[PDB]
């Protein structure tokens, strides 16, 4: 076995797609082990949490999810100055 997050945890360690920041929309992992859209409404680097918003849930529910749980994946990534987004 290997063991790390050694390298200053706390910060977003390098990860192609996943961006740990304030406002960020990511996906979480819930109880159900089932994959859903969220952001971070805040981050907490002196405890290594932040609090991140599930939109599942109708009634707008937030919980803290430690950046260094692990369950969390790159969601969609928005349109990069899209081209002629509209037309009229």
């Given at each position: ?14 990860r192609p797609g996943i ?7 990511l ?46 994946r790159p969601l969609?990534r ?11």
């Amino acid at each position: 076995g290997s063991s790390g997050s050694s390298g200053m945890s706390k910060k977003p360690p390098n990860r192609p797609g996943i961006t740990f920041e304030i406002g960020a929309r990511l996906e979480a992992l819930d109880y159900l082990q089932k994959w859903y859209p969220s952001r971070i409404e805040k981050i907490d680097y002196e405890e290594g949490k932040m609090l991140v918003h599930f939109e599942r849930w109708s009634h707008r529910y937030d919980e803290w999810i430690y950046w260094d749980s692990n369950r969390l994946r790159p969601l969609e990534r928005p349109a990069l100055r899209k081209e002629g987004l509209k037309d009229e």
